Symmetry: D2
């Protein structure tokens, strides 16, 4: 039962493009990629080659194929300890999934700042451009279970654990700059509303159901983040192509004790890019693991996800100078008002070894801050501090979750805490309390100071009575949704209208749809009317007369809120499908692959069967997947080289591949006789912007294709796609 | 610095006698002691000196004295993540105690065989006299909680984890050679009966209650082990001075495949020694930690517990050669019929560092055997195999309890099991199943063989129908209790009678007492009558006429079953109280201490207060304890030197000290004017055997005293103690 | 039938003095003692007389004496689902004991006010002397495990669950009017100091050891409660003969919104009484369940613990 | 035991039998049933041995396994009949 003679069962331990080699554990794929945290896991990494199969007690197993029984057709015997241990371990493999963000995908990397930030913070990880901090990052959806699909419409989580020299800092953020609700007390109400309904546990991975829109209609504070969710921000192309935000205002504290308010940002260096809805929903069926897969394969290819950390900084004295409250997590701070200052770069460059041990058991918590950082009174941040430690006690089995290898600090940790389930550390200290004289009081408290000091909270002034009351300054709900709406391109606005229309059409109780349309009328009449028309609802005269909400500190728009208004495309790490035929013109393929390789764009060679095809010059071309096996949903663009086109001209799947790519606004390039396929997509002898066409695939043909790919999608095609039946 | 200037907070890191230094974690007390297991724990040992106090996430704490609040008399704030972690870990410190044997005390050591046993077993740890195997041993009671008292009347557990090169072997035994019940199906019934009664959860650490003796009276299989429990076996002096047994017949399997039946023995190299009942019961009040303390202090002193492993070996063809069934765990194998063959020595030479991490979390399971051993059909052993892995899933929080440091094999372990709560090991194997090609089928099964082979069970023949039926060969209940009884000295018999009499006096429902008396009449008439008289029960004429049970294979006694019939005294490690006065005769103390030192006997110097007293010659004598502080219960003998006796002659505590020791049969030595104390214990002018007296404490005064100590107690004093009010 | 002919196995369901009858579950001993909470437990109370022995799945058991095996001297079979459920349930009986106050003894009762307190509090259970509130009270020591002794020197816990018409109120007090420490942040330090020391887990149920007195010496805030623990307060004769205190100042709030500061007290109607030290220590060996037994037998006798 | 938190999973309402269930098992996490039986073991006299074993029979009898003959050696071996 052995490995093939040719070694083909084992991936090469070098970077390789997606599909070229089977995927593997990060330490076997990239053994020479290291960082302090990855090295520190070596105490628990376990190999396998050349070792005997044993029980967990170290007893060699002779027959792992059979239970012990009284005769070979007889009853199994109670004394089979080998069977019992193996089955008992299997029986207890599962642990509770995260209450939210159960579905997530993670990787290791490192961070470093561009310059010391000691003027504004004493945080050690921000103190020196040449001090590298290992990180572990998990990206996630919110609503669905661990086994739900990746490319749903949802908010995404973006959690980073920095293993710093002065402690672990977890920056536990999402991919939009606000949240749905103002006070943590409502969190279980909002999450219950979005999650599968309690009677029948439907729907998975979708906000398109009555209870969510019932809560939204009755809680207008939710409308800002609902706008972001209904836009294409809700369906990113990759975790590499979305923004990250800490949402809350936090504090930075410098050595002089000065507090500066801050909001955290991550900028994706691969650019912002999202799917369109029909593509994202069909992709949850064709590959529900698409984002997990794409992230792992990018890292194996060397297309490391990179993000720039940035800070919006507001001096203490400017706390009240905006027309929103800085502590309200449903309000964003527009970059036109407060620019994002670039802080440092994070690069994710190694996949884990074991998903369960490292991803599933990772515990992030926004209370894990370090000296130089502090909280504010944001009432959603405040309540989050009661949750993340608590939930970890059932999910991870008790209070020693920081000893699970992935969660361990790389810096020293010593205290008087003892015992708890699954206690790993064996403490030698004669004392388990302080103050003590029997160990001369060690370990000892450390005064706060400029570097290496103990944690002290900023001495913020508190004055108020003990109340359960929402601050009046939080009671405005329409101006930020409007700012967001007005900052989108026209095609982005169409996509928002379509998201609301699609979701509300799934709400069974029509009055809820009506109540939501009335809320949209308080944001923008054009948005409200367009959603209403799709729902067969007619706005009343009163609704038509609702005064729009005020501008945000005079802003009519802020283009930083759009995915696409400002070009920032990067083609490196994108993928093209190349549709083969049984006599491919090799000069086309040479030019195609050469130009793709120059820009770091991968290719997948597709055909109507697996195996190989031979090109016109005898080159044997291995086939990656069939047209049906790897649909156009999984690539950024489609190229059809010249060759024996009649081979594929009447193939339904090949035609369909182009129809689906066209519908989803992807660039398509057709060389030589492949231009015969123009007829399937109904599109003119003169040509069309978004369709590259020439006699052969040369320098020019490929430059045009790659230019289109840098703009991500062919938005100008949108009016043409409603008539195509795909 | 809170430690004293003089460094008297820190115990000397060298062997010191009990009470000389404060006790300490083993790696601090005895850093030079080592074995392979203790070395392999070093990766999880955590020190403390010179380290900052931190959270578990590695953030330095500045103020570990206060919560974060709004104003120094204001409310505590939710944002206090340092408070929240510290209190949350504290809130989750406890894990379930063991369902049985929850009270126990453990130490590290090592084992070495005297010679290779390869002719009878291929067990690697028995293959070479040079092969030393680390062990971890936990002794225990059975009934009481982890916080119950040590010197109760109960069975004791004696569990040894051998960290062998071919897997962990757990020898999970007790201090008597049989158990109470025959089939594992009744274990919850017998354990419910002996445990605190379910309405009110009384009594702790005691079988002296109705439900226990109800069960016994209805289940005569239990009488054998009940005789043992009622004897002085049920109240050992020390874990160092008790026997151990595996109880069941197991098999040894050699390299040629030959099975030999075996029963396991531990022989205490310090000899056999028990308390007397009143002393044991009082001792649960004055020092409920006495066995735990004595074991730890013996190891700190270098009085390492030593035991010899012994095997009773019975050829397969002798299975049926006895009057009892070899597979019946209520039957012992008389050493007169099958001698114990010496196998090797175990030495316990290092205390844990942390009680919770190493002792409380240790998991032993008799299913944990290695190649060269195997099971038999003993139906109590059979059922044990269903329980010990199971219970560890809740007690230790899931199926990775073998990854808790104390439980980890020292030899390799590799398999395809994955996940589970608190998973430590990060598996890099591409495969988590077999057969696989993708990791060339590693780790791989190993055929069985002479050494380093896979586990194969002995191909014992099974034939019979599927039945829930007791073997008729097990249905004999009285002959072994009788053999045990007749093998005891007359004072041991007296103490058995008094154990049943006291326990049955605490049974509220008189009929249960009568029913037990009826059972005893089936064992021996002298026994039954003597208990009956203590209970005001008169035997009937039918009871007086029950034929006693047959002898066991012609034996009318076996002196190996007695604690004391064959003296095997060892004074090393025992302890003597020395009652001081304010003008001690220094020459007496010098002689006493010199003699005790030479035989490795410790001393405690006692007075009526702490501090120091000064001898006739100006020698300053420090006081270890008061008379009331360290009662006679806690030592093996009492010496009163000469001096200013009038100082203590009218001290009630000093007089009582001697009365209590006298009652409990301990040697007492009185020098010079200390002889005045003869009157308090009513000793005749010309003396009596067991009281050592002279004008001074020597020439022969110390030899006489140490001769009495070697015989443990003064049994000939028994007729005398009833008159003494103590 | 295994019971005696004369019925002497079953205790009389009438009050009887200590030792006169075997003690029994409270609904069998005093079936007509009732309060709203006791009655509400009837949905989960399970009897036993005259019912077949079954598995937890309701399958009747023929032979509860033997495992299933291949031959009467053969190996035990994996298919014995009856043996497996019974042993599995036994294997999982224990739950973690309380981190502190693990040793404790409890009973049901009721509370009634002497007068309406509506002038000082709107708490419904204090609104009318005819308002009867069921209670469940647990008395405890602090340091020792669930299996440690009762008559140790320790503080005692005195916790009352009031099942009121407007919610459960738990008054979680001790038998001294102050605590050892000022700020909850130090609780794990104080508790670790008094608890068995971590190297060897000694001593049980005792403050008489180095780490406790090390902490007290370095933390003079402890000295007040330490005085109480060193007094005979530390060794009550009975949970019926000790005081209870809430310790903290709380507030009462009335219907007008007026706050009054309050401290809570329980005053024993059997009066105050403690043992002496030598008696208490010795009693931990002769009867480590002495307080638990005393309380149960007092209630069986009709000597109901009463507190004001 | 892990998925449902302990050995009292048959007391979760959906899993409860509708017929009587009585035995000597006690405690476990999440225990709902409050047993009043003086005994928690059998055989006992203090509750006249109730709840009692029931012989097998045509209806309402105890469970007894069919007495299938077993004959063979203790082996970890697949039957050739399965190959
Ligand atoms: C701005 C608002 C919030 C953001 C950006 C946020 C972000 C996240 C992210 C990214 C994760 C997953 C971390 C991972 O990958 O393991 C997560 C988990 C979680 N969050 Fe939040 N969250 C927010 C609000 C809240 C609130 C208000 C609560 C409760 C008060 C909460 C409770 C939790 C819980 C219980 C988990 C599961 C954590 C675990 O099992 O380890 N979240 N959150
Ligand atoms: C010859 C008869 C038996 C002997 C010699 C014996 C011995 C022991 C000992 C010494 C321990 C404590 C190990 C330690 O120190 O951690 C123990 C624990 C235990 N035993 Fe046994 N036992 C016997 C019968 C049984 C039976 C018949 C069962 C159930 C079928 C059983 C189930 C248990 C359980 C559940 C534990 C707690 C184990 C743990 O929590 O790790 N025992 N036994
Ligand atoms: C005035 C001070 C205190 C008093 C009067 C008090 C009283 C008590 C009592 C009587 C119990 C036992 C309740 C029962 O019988 O189940 C108990 C349990 C407990 N206490 Fe306190 N206590 C005090 C301080 C604290 C502090 C400061 C903490 C921690 C911040 C704490 C944490 C606990 C915990 C974790 C338990 C176990 C509760 C359980 O498992 O259900 N206590 N306390």
């Amino acid at each position: 039962s052995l490995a093939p003679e040719d070694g083909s069962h084992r991936p090469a331990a070098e970077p390789t493009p997606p599909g070229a080699q089977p995927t593997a554990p990060g330490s076997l794929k990239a053994p020479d990629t290291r960082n302090e945290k990855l090295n520190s896991l070596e105490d628990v990494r376990k190999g396998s080659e050349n070792y005997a199969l044993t029980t967990n007690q170290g007893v060699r197993i002779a027959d792992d194929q059979n239970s012990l029984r009284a005769g070979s057709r007889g009853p199994t015997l109670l004394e089979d300890f080998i069977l019992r241990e193996k089955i008992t371990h299997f029986d207890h493999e599962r642990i509770p999934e995260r209450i939210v963000h159960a579905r997530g995908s993670a990787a290791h990397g490192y961070f470093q700042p561009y310059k010391s930030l000691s003027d504004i913070t004493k945080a050690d990880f921000l103190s020196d451009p040449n001090k590298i901090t290992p990180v572990f990052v998990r990206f996630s959806t919110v609503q669905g279970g661990a086994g739900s699909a990746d490319t749903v419409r949802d908010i995404r989580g973006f959690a980073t654990k920095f293993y710093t020299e002065e402690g672990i800092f977890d920056l536990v953020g999402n991919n939009t700059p606000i949240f749905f609700i103002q006070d943590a007390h409502k969190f279980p109400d909002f999450v219950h509303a979005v999650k599968p309904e309690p009677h029948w546990a439907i729907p998975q991975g979708q906000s398109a159901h009555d209870t969510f829109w019932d809560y939204v209609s009755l809680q207008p504070e939710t409308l800002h983040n609902v706008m972001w969710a209904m836009s294409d921000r809700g369906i990113p192309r990759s975790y590499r192509t979305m923004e990250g935000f800490g949402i809350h205002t936090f504090r930075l504290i410098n050595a002089e004790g000065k507090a500066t308010f801050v909001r955290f940002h991550w900028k994706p260096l691969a650019g912002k890019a999202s799917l369109v809805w029909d593509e994202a929903q069909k992709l949850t069926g064709r590959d529900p693991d698409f984002h997990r897969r794409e992230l792992w394969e990018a890292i194996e290819a060397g297309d490391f996800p990179e993000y720039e950390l940035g800070f919006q900084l507001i001096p203490e004295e400017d706390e009240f100078k905006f027309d929103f409250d800085l502590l309200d997590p449903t309000k964003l701070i527009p970059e036109e008002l407060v620019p994002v200052q670039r802080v440092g770069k994070m690069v994710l460059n190694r996949n884990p070894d074991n998903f369960f041990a490292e991803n599933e058991q990772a515990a992030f918590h926004p209370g894990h801050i370090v000296p130089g950082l502090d909280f504010t009174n944001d009432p959603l941040l405040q309540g989050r501090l009661e949750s993340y430690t608590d939930t970890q006690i059932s999910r991870l089995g008790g209070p020693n979750f920081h000893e699970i290898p992935i969660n361990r600090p790389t810096c020293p940790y010593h205290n008087f805490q003892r015992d708890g389930m699954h206690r790993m550390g064996i403490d030698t200290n004669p004392a388990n309390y302080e103050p003590n004289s029997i160990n001369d009081n060690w370990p000892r408290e450390t005064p706060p100071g400029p570097k290496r000091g103990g944690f002290e909270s900023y001495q913020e002034r508190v004055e108020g009575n003990k109340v359960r009351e929402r601050s009046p300054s939080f009671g405005e709900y329409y101006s930020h949704p409007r700012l967001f709406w007005l900052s989108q391109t026209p095609f982005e606005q169409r996509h928002i209208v379509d998201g609301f229309s699609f979701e509300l059409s799934k709400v069974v109780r029509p009055y809820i749809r009506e109540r939501v349309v009335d809320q949209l009328a308080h944001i923008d009449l054009t948005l409200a009317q367009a959603v209403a028309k799709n729902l067969g609802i007619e706005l009343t005269d009163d609704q038509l007369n609702i005064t729009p909400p005020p501008d945000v500190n005079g802003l009519k728009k802020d283009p930083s809120l759009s995915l696409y208004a400002i070009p920032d495309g990067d083609v490196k790490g994108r993928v093209v499908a190349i549709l083969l035929n049984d006599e491919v013109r090799s000069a086309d393929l040479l030019a195609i692959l050469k130009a793709l390789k120059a820009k770091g764009v991968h290719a997948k060679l597709l055909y109507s069967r697996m195996g190989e095809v031979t090109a016109d010059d005898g080159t044997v071309l291995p086939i990656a997947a069939t047209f049906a096996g790897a649909p156009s949903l999984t690539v950024d663009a489609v190229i059809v080289p010249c060759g024996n086109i009649a081979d594929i001209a009447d193939n339904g799947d090949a035609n369909y591949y182009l129809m689906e790519a066209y519908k989803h606004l992807k660039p398509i390039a057709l060389a030589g006789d492949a231009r015969k396929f123009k007829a399937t997509i109904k599109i003119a002898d003169q040509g069309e912007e978004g369709i590259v066409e020439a006699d052969s695939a040369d320098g020019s043909f490929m430059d045009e294709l790659l230019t289109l790919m840098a703009a991500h999608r062919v938005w100008s095609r949108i009016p043409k796609i409603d008539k195509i039946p795909a």
